[PDB]
Ligand binder design. Structure first.
Ligand SMILES: Cc1cc2c3c(c1C)C(C)(C)CC=[N+]3c1c([nH]c(=O)[nH]c1=O)N2C[C@H](O)[C@H](O)[C@H](O)COP(=O)(O)O
Ligand SMILES: Cc1cc2c3c(c1C)C(C)(C)CC=[N+]3c1c([nH]c(=O)[nH]c1=O)N2C[C@H](O)[C@H](O)[C@H](O)COP(=O)(O)O
Ligand SMILES: O=C(O)C#Cc1ccccc1
Ligand SMILES: O=C(O)C#Cc1ccccc1
Ligand SMILES: O=C(O)C#Cc1ccccc1
Ligand SMILES: O=C(O)C#Cc1ccccc1
Ligand SMILES: O=C(O)C#Cc1ccccc1
Ligand SMILES: O=C(O)C#Cc1ccccc1
Ligand SMILES: [K+]
Ligand SMILES: [K+]
Ligand SMILES: [K+]
Ligand SMILES: [K+]
Ligand SMILES: [Mn+2]
Ligand SMILES: [Mn+2]
Lengths: 500, 500
């Protein structure tokens, strides 16, 4: 099976790429596997595959860390991501995001039901597993539980059957047959849960599939629109219908090649302790347990020699940056264009801990609008901060065409030099806020509201007559023939490879 | 003579360090020398010494570019700066700034007058030079003149004789015997000029010395207090009295080993076209000529085989970042401590284009103050933004003890995650602003006023009971014995030198 359509194939692909380290000696899921993965993520090293995990029994389980993290070279920096999508390993971020957005103006390709698959190779009923006896990792020393779920896909369906959502949300082991996790507004798992809670008759049928097709986990991490079934969007994106098998204990469908599947229910009434967890912004607040949603597990099915993917998330750079930030930025780009705003590109700078999105403006189009900073900032912020795709983002930075928003140095330069604090900014206090940011949930104000800003790093003439500066840099402050002379004589004179 | 006390010796020191490229083939001062230097600065390469400059005659002049720019290795990143100060080349920024602040609580060591020096080896009277025939560089393609003065020291004295100021301010050739340049508030050259203009009797006696003692050019770039003679501060800092010779045509004193000295007057009445110039924030606005101050040159004296230092300034990283930003930050640290604020360290992040200063707070001391963010932000901003040392800085970022303010990634992390936009910030509109920042002088508001902010990246418990988080990083989220195990087994497992 192709790497983008089968996680087991993806793992081979990383090997083939010389992007995997197989660790065949015993590694402890209590902190060690996550510590190694954390080091990998902070240094852009090869992904670790833990083949000998202390506590693995009867095939459950191996761990792959850092599945969507960065490579060290600049030329294939995003190669792990490209390998989720059938793209060349040298693909740019623009290319990856465009691939993720491509299905937005295509007919869905609905999934194909098949009678079996590798995820049915083994099974454990309600009398044969205990989630506290599996080698579930403790990811951070202060975590409030063992987070089994950092890179699987939750599957829930509206009560009317019309929308089946696939999404990533964290969950930890509560007891032998339950998890607790985040189910929060405005996320689709929460929107669907509220539909079942209003109906009031039963718990939500649920499945959690780990080691799904890589193209599916990418869409699981993306804020595609309300009511859109991720499986058909992934089908359209890949050009192929995904093969799904029915769960044994409910009528949901899971990818045929899923490594591990939990089947059960998400309660409409019960909660349990959840967190704290070392989170995407880089922090854990020890002892901040809150109540989360509660999941009951009725059955486990799994591949022979099953592999559990794991995100050891925190400080830069991991899946919570590369995927959450970038995929939100992609959706925000589209949303702005659909609202007739002249945005060409969007990216969440890693330097901002993916709390900012930089929006590149087509300033020829802006000029034709004959508008002003205040008016344009308000328009952009109203579109983005009132939408679910803007949930995680607290600062939007508007920049002109000379800025490559995928280059954080250039975004920082523009922000620092082109946006006058206060005057060039509009604050938004009456929008949904993201509590996970420390200055929100542990800050001075309401955890769930406000704290957002549009920072306009467009210069005044960009709205009127055109850019009126040149950069004081080698590229712009010297003519072409001189530049080339310098470059051609560089090593000759005594001064000091793309791939590496 | 020691490298910190003699520019010619400094140039040898860079050679010895394998930090110099000598270019002995002809190089054009029209753009080429500056283009090479610009490339050096953007890539942290070796400093270029142009020994065969097209237009050099009778010893005037060679050029040294990038005298205070960065080296490529992390271990000696600031080594050029350290070589201005007799510090080991591996000196940290903290060590450099502490050296620069050390004279602040020492008695001055006034300079020693000597009868001659190398700067008297050659001379040109009022009938024998023409500044338009020297090989003055065109530094950026759109500059409004040839900027002779990018790394020399202006020398002016109060009318009462009590204060002799040394400072860097740009100047360009106006005609055969005049320069024009920036003389702007609140700078000391401007404060002294205003004293002479109020007296109304004569132009200001002036000298401009190029290739001065490196320790002197560093103090020239630092906002030491009003009324403090830089020569005695440098004397105290170095432990040695500087040797100075009298000018021939006036009674000012110049460093004995200066490479090139201009003697003349700074007018109290005349102005001429000045700029535009590719400036420290990374921009040039072509055609934005303004009127600047006007200098008359009466005499030139110079060393045999004189060398002119040059800053090819603009985008990161050059002297306008390493020296202006860092030295302002140093002075701001001291100023805050003298105002009883619990600041331990200050640095202007390069990523901010040196428009921010991050202030590290001793949070044990803060806790004892029993204050709040709003009150503390206001206090800090009132101290800094009302003082000359705060002139160039538009954003102050307050961070707690876990943040190394000399590491821009960590400052950015804290700012992005700990300061809630709007709520955690205080804007200052009734303070002097820095017009050079594009969003000031070419922006939407007054060029000279406001646009400043204090951004509080202290978390709430830092004011009360203490930090209440751990970072989600390898350092903080894993115990010591595990961390060391990981590190000790890193290369064994398959994963991947300080000097490099
Ligand atoms: C890549 C990724 C995405 C996580 C995520 C993680 C990763 C690795 C974790 C598991 C390591 C840490 C926390 N995660 C959560 C999360 N969204 C959320 O509601 N709760 C979460 O706990 N997300 C983001 C979420 O997947 C996106 O917001 C999707 O848009 C949600 O899908 P939906 O639009 O269908 O609701
Ligand atoms: C290192 C350095 C410092 C420049 C400088 C440059 C460099 C390389 C240039 C020449 C390349 C670009 C512009 N410069 C100017 C400047 N200050 C100023 O008033 N006008 C300037 O034109 N400065 C900053 C100035 O030297 C500091 O603000 C000092 O504190 C001034 O000394 P003072 O406190 O005695 O007034
Ligand atoms: O645990 C965390 O890092 C988280 C989270 C989250 C929640 C909603 C949307 C995106 C990320
Ligand atoms: O209660 C919510 O709405 C929430 C939340 C949350 C918690 C942790 C990380 C991200 C969001
Ligand atoms: O109810 C509140 O004020 C709260 C909260 C919140 C939610 C998630 C994470 C952190 C704080
Ligand atoms: O020409 C520029 O880059 C400049 C400048 C300046 C002026 C005052 C204080 C610091 C820098
Ligand atoms: O007119 C002033 O006060 C000024 C100024 C200035 C110009 C260029 C760069 C920095 C400051
Ligand atoms: O008088 C003004 O408004 C002005 C100005 C200014 C000064 C220096 C640089 C840019 C603008
Ligand atoms: K999704
Ligand atoms: K602006
Ligand atoms: K000075
Ligand atoms: K704060
Ligand atoms: Mn969805
Ligand atoms: Mn001074």
């Amino acid at each position: 099976q192709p790497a983008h359509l089968c996680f087991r194939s993806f793992v081979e692909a990383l090997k083939v790429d010389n992007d995997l380290v197989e660790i065949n000696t015993p590694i402890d899921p209590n902190l060690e596997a996550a510590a190694i993965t954390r080091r990998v993520c902070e240094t852009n090293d090869k992904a670790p595959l833990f083949n000998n995990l202390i506590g693995m029994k009867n095939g459950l389980f191996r761990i792959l860390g850092a599945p969507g993290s960065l490579r060290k070279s600049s030329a294939d920096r995003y190669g792990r991501l490209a390998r989720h999508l059938a793209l060349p390993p040298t693909a740019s971020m623009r290319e990856i995001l465009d691939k993720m957005l491509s299905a937005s103006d295509m007919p869905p390709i609905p999934p194909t039901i098949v009678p079996t698959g590798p995820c049915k190779e083994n099974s454990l009923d309600d009398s044969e597993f205990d989630l506290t006896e599996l080698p579930v990792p403790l990811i951070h020393k202060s975590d409030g539980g063992k987070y089994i779920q950092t890179y699987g896909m939750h599957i829930v369906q509206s009560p009317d059957g019309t929308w089946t959502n696939w999404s990533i949300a964290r969950a930890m082991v509560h007891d032998k047959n339950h998890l607790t996790g985040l189910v929060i507004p405005p996320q689709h798992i929460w929107q669907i849960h509220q539909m079942w809670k209003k109906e009031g008759r039963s718990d939500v049928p649920w499945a959690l599939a780990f080691g799904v097709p890589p193209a599916a986990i990418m869409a699981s991490s993306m804020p595609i629109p309300d009511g859109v079934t991720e499986a058909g969007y992934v089908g359209a994106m890949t050009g192929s219908s995904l093969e799904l098998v029915k769960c044994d204990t409910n009528d949901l469908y899971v990818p045929a090649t899923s490594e591990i599947v939990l089947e059960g229910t998400l309660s409409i009434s019960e909660t349990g302790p959840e967190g704290p967890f070392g989170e995407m912004h880089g922090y854990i607040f020890p002892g901040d347990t809150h109540l989360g949603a509660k999941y009951k597990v009725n059955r486990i099915t799994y591949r022979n020699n099953a592999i559990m993917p794991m995100s050891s998330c925190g400080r830069l750079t991991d899946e919570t940056h590369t995927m959450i930030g970038s995929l939100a930025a992609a959706e925000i780009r589209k949303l702005c264009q659909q609202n007739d705003l002249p945005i060409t590109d969007a990216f969440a700078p890693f330097e901002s801990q993916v709390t900012w999105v930089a929006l590149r403006v087509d300033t020829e189009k802006l000029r034709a609008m004959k508008t002003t900073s205040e008016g344009f900032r308000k328009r952009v912020g109203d579109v983005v901060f009132n939408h679910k795709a803007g949930y995680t983002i607290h600062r939007l930075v508007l920049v002109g065409d000379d800025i490559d928003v995928y280059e954080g140095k250039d975004v920082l330069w523009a922000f620092s030099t082109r946006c006058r604090p206060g005057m060039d900014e509009t604050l938004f206090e009456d929008v949904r806020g993201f509590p996970g940011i420390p200055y929100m949930g542990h800050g001075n104000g309401p955890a769930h509201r406000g704290g957002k800003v549009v920072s306009d790093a467009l210069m005044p003439t960009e709205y009127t007559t055109g850019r009126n500066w040149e950069a004081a840099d080698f590229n712009q402050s010297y003519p072409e023939d001189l530049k080339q002379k310098v470059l051609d004589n560089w090593t000759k004179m005594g001064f000091s490879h793309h791939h590496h």
